[PDB]
């Protein structure tokens with residue numbers, strides 16, 4: 001009546017054999033889970049990573065959060081220890097309900113969350129932690145270091161595929177051999193939650209997958225939307241909260257919001273829910289919108305990742321970003337070429353998939369270069385784009401991160417446009433322009449061939 005809970009998302013309980021390889025398992029469940037956008041994974045009963053921490057030495061800077069539906073919030077950026085945060089969080093919840101924190105039904109907290117964010121009268125504010133691992137607050141999974149000797153139990157999980165520190169650097173991921181500095185995206189994030197602290201509706205940068213583990217504490221409640229419904233969700237959001245779609249100045253100025261899933265379901269957006277309990281994984285699929293809130297004091301860890309399934313979507317995403325003039329986190333083409341340059345050490349299924357994306361890349365690049373030559377750009381010079389700081393190689397028009405090529409003019413020292421935007425650089429005639437290119441077509445075809453050879457083994 002007030003709140004109707006979405007249907008439950010799929011839950012998987014893999015055997016140890018199924019569970020052992022995360023990439024194989026994810027690939028297996030994909031036909032099911034990509035229809036719901038999120039799914040939950042319960043590890044085999046004895047997969048039990050050790051959690052040990054001194055709650056008095058772990059400290060972090062809390063973020064503060066107002067809970068109002070449709071109100072704009074920014075995506076990223078006082079001091080608590082984990083103990084004092086926990087004490088604040090438990091006291092907040094038990095005072096809010098006049099009940100012991102674990103006797104509050106999850107259904108009631110959910111019901112109450114959607115009441116309070118919708119009511120103008122209520123101004124509930126809460127606090128939470130969000131950051132990558134640091135020396136003041138490290139991963140919840142075991143990691144190697146010289147100062148501290150690990151237990152056999154800890155040593156056991158150092159190399160698990162489901163140890164999220166490993167996830168980026170494994171063989172079936174395509175961020176395995178990448179060099180670029182993208183700390184925000186390839187490293188796990190740590191999240192300290194409290195009752196009602198929430199994550200707004202969003203998809204991951206570059207439409208990547210995410211995997212999310214709840215180390216300990218009260219559950220995390222999720223809502224998820226399949227990738228095929230992303231634009232329908234965005235249309236609903238645009239109608240109700242147009243303020244969120246204004247042009248973003250920087251990459252750290254993305255606007256996001258809380259919105260009732262019933263509102264989406266009313267507008268024919270399929271939504272699924274789940275309560276993630278301690279020791280369970282949630283996986284989000286490419287372009288799957290998700291949001292949620294915490295039932296109480298808890299500690300989660302999450303990481304982005306990209307499988308071979310994702311590669312063509314990664315290309316479509318960058319294209320989508322260009323149309324929106326949205327900043328990129330990294331160059332997709334640069335990643336592809338980096339992998340091609342390491343074709344000999346690539347996993348062979350990876351090589352095969354990269355080869356297919358590269359073929360599309362080369363065909364598109366060939367066409368774009370013919371077009372800019374017909375616009376009268378004649379002069380050219382090789383340019384090592386990967387050496388430029390990222391904010392020094394964005395298209396002044398569409399903000400895309402250049403790598404394959406760009407146009408420059410000595411009239412505008414340091415400015416670049418991608419080849420879709422030759423006419424947006426300056427008023428000089430095109431013969432004053434230079435095509436800056438990373439590779440000639442004669443460079444590119446042998447790189448692609450190396451991938452083919454590797455994939456033919």
Ligand SMILES: N#CCSc1nc(-c2ccccc2)cc(=O)[nH]1
Pocket residue numbers: 075076128130191192193197198199200212294300302
């Ligand atoms: N999405 C996702 C991972 S779960 C999570 N994510 C957050 C969050 C996300 C973006 C920015 C700040 C916090 C808070 C929290 O409790 N849990």
Ligand SMILES: [Cl-]
Pocket residue numbers: 067068069116117118119120121122123124
């Ligand atoms: Cl409110």
Ligand SMILES: [Mn+2]
Pocket residue numbers: 202203204210284290
């Ligand atoms: Mn997310």
Ligand SMILES: [Mn+2]
Pocket residue numbers: none
């Ligand atoms: Mn020059």
Ligand SMILES: [Zn+2]
Pocket residue numbers: 395396397398399400417418419420421
């Ligand atoms: Zn451009």
Ligand SMILES: [Zn+2]
Pocket residue numbers: 409410411412426427428432
């Ligand atoms: Zn000029």
